[PDB]
Amino acid sequence: MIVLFVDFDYFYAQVEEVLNPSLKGKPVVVCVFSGRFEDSGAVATANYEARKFGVKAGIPIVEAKKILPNAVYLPMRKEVYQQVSSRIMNLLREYSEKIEIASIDEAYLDISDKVRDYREAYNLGLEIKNKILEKEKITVTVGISKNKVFAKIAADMAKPNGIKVIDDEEVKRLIRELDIADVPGIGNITAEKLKKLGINKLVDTLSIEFDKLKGMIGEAKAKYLISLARDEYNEPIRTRVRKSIGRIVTMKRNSRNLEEIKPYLFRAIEESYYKLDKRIPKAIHVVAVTEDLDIVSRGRTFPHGISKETAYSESVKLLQKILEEDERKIRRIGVRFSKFI
DNA sequence: GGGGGAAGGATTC
DNA sequence: CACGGAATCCTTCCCCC
Ligand SMILES: Nc1nc2c(ncn2[C@H]2C[C@H](O)[C@@H](COP(=O)(O)OP(=O)(O)OP(=O)(O)O)O2)c(=O)[nH]1
Ligand SMILES: [Ca+2]
Ligand SMILES: [Ca+2]
Ligand SMILES: [Ca+2]
Numbered sequence: 001m002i003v004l005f006v007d008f009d010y011f012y013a014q015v016e017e018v019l020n021p022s023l024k025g026k027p028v029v030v031c032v033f034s035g036r037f038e039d040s041g042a043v044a045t046a047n048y049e050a051r052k053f054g055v056k057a058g059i060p061i062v063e064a065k066k067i068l069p070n071a072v073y074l075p076m077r078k079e080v081y082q083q084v085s086s087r088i089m090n091l092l093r094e095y096s097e098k099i100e101i102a103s104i105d106e107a108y109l110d111i112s113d114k115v116r117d118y119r120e121a122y123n124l125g126l127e128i129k130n131k132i133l134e135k136e137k138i139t140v141t142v143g144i145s146k147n148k149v150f151a152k153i154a155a156d157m158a159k160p161n162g163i164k165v166i167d168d169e170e171v172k173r174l175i176r177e178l179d180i181a182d183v184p185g186i187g188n189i190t191a192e193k194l195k196k197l198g199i200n201k202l203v204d205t206l207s208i209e210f211d212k213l214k215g216m217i218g219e220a221k222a223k224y225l226i227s228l229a230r231d232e233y234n235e236p237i238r239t240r241v242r243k244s245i246g247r248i249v250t251m252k253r254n255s256r257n258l259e260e261i262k263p264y265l266f267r268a269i270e271e272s273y274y275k276l277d278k279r280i281p282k283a284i285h286v287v288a289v290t291e292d293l294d295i296v297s298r299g300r301t302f303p304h305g306i307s308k309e310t311a312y313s314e315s316v317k318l319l320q321k322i323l324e325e326d327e328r329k330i331r332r333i334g335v336r337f338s339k340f341i
Numbered sequence: 342g343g344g345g346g347a348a349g350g351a352t353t354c
Numbered sequence: 355c356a357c358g359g360a361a362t363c364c365t366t367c368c369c370c371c
Contacts, residue, residue: 032357042357057354060355076357103354104359185362187353220363221352244360283347293356297349332357 001112002121003237005143005151006092006128008085008105009160013047015081016074018137025049027071031061034250039065044076048160088136095128100148100237108148110237118144118165125163145171147233152184175229176203185224193217205229245279246287247271248334254291256329258320265319268334269311280305281337286318289332297336298322305341 008014012030017023027050033041041061050071055064061073085104093099098110115121125142132140142163143155150166153174158164166174180199181191193216199205205213205225214222227233247268255261265286284306285299298318306314315335323330 034357040355040357042355044357058356061357062355078359106354185353189352218364240361242360246359248358250357285348289357295350299348301347334358336360 001110001146001234002115002118003145003148003151004096004109004111004121004125004128005148005155006107006109006140007143007152007155007159008088008138008140010045010047010051011085011105011138012045012076012081013050014138015084016077017047018084019080023072027053027055027068029055029061029064029068029071029073030076031064031073032076033061036250036252040250046071084136084138088132088138088140091131091135092128095124098237100240102240106152108151108237118167122163122165129161129163148235148237149184149228149233150174153178153182156182171231174202175231176201178202180204180225183225183228185221190217190221199225202229243340244336244338245272245275245281246285246334246336247275248287248289248332250332251330254329254331256323258316258323261319261330261333262316265315265333265335266312269308269315272335272337273308273311276337280341281339282306282341283337283339284311284314284318285336285338286315286322287334287336288319288322288326288330290326290328291331292328293331294328296322296326298325299336301339306337311335311337 013028016028016030029046029050030044031041032044039061043055043057043059043061043064045057046055050068053067055067089101089107092107092109096109096111096114100108102108111121111124115124121144125144129140129142132138139161141155141159141161143151145151145154145166146168150171154164154166180186180194180202183202197208197216206229249264249268251264282305283301285297287297289295298321300314
């Protein structure tokens with residue numbers, strides 16, 4: 001099977017440039033301001049001219065200002081990036097019908113019935129890249145291989161604005177050279193666990209007894225690594241469906257006062273419903289980020305849909321259940337709706 | 342012994 | 355000093371055949 005993976009370069013920042021080309025060349029950082037003070041918040045992402053100095057997704061906006069005081073700092077405009085993404089995805093949907101939109105800027109295309117041998121795939125790659133650069137003026141990186149995982153790894157090795165192919169032979173070389181940490185799905189928590197098992201390469205997962213790999217990282221992940229090691233990973237590409245909609249917000253100050261948190265929670269609910277489109281959820285979860293960046297949630301499933309009146313009422317009850325079972329102060333509050341009809 | 346929810350936590354991207 | 359949207363997986367409790 002031949003899988004082509006696409007991943008837009010420094011997406012949010014690159015969109016901000018396209019919309020104001022006068023930004024190209026200068027350091028661009030897209031921020032999410034929490035409003036706890038002037039520049040409280042984090043970096044959603046930044047362009048290469050900024051990333052080369054350490055400014056990247058996840059760090060505090062303040063840290064970023066210490067490093068690049070003169071960089072251009074723009075507030076994150078999610079709705080806009082979302083549309084630019086949709087237009088591109090619609091464009092990809094014309095090079096293949098079997099498409100899986102993994103994230104706001106990732107997509108896997110199954111082009112097995114559109115080509116043969118990696119030569120035409122590469123060409124189909126430059127075709128897509130050129131097309132996207134023409135109609136939306138966005139640069140993307142392409143990855144091509146036998147399955148979704150290897151297609152993604154390929155892209156990573158080819159960024160930025162690149163394209164690469166990992167053939168059935170190149171793959172065999174990766175199973176022994178690739179750090180188990182650079183495999184998708186293996187974050188820091190899992191990378192260290194596999195380290196204590198003497199698993200530094202994908203192939204090394206074949207040495208341990210399955211029963212103790214499972215004991216360390218769970219069955220799912222275990223069978224996952226083993227499959228990629230035996231070159232037996234072959235997950236189908238397919239339309240993924242939104243199964244959850246929600247909204248979280250940060251409060252000016254950490255609180256425990258129910259009447260103090262409510263207005264925030266109610267704002268989360270109001271946006272969540274507008275976002276719901278016209279979907280009827282039967283489950284609702286209240287999510288709170290406590291004072292020490294720890295997450296705690298409480299929810300309920302109903303035998304019928306949830307009107308907005310019911311969401312309001314139940315959310316307050318669920319928040320109360322949280323303050324009563326956790327002594328910590330609340331920093332962030334939000335709601336999540338699921339189990340749509 | 343075991344299926345399927347539901348709930349709350351844990352990780353990853 | 356650190357935001358957010360959402361998917362998947364895990365352990366536990368449960369009701370009960
Ligand atoms: N709000 C928020 N957005 C994030 C975060 N991490 C990534 N994103 C955004 C950044 C991009 O706009 C989009 C895709 O992220 P990627 O990991 O693919 O990196 P990016 O697109 O920045 O460029 P790259 O792949 O490194 O060339 O998702 C995050 O921590 N918070
Ligand atoms: Ca990207
Ligand atoms: Ca991406
Ligand atoms: Ca990693």
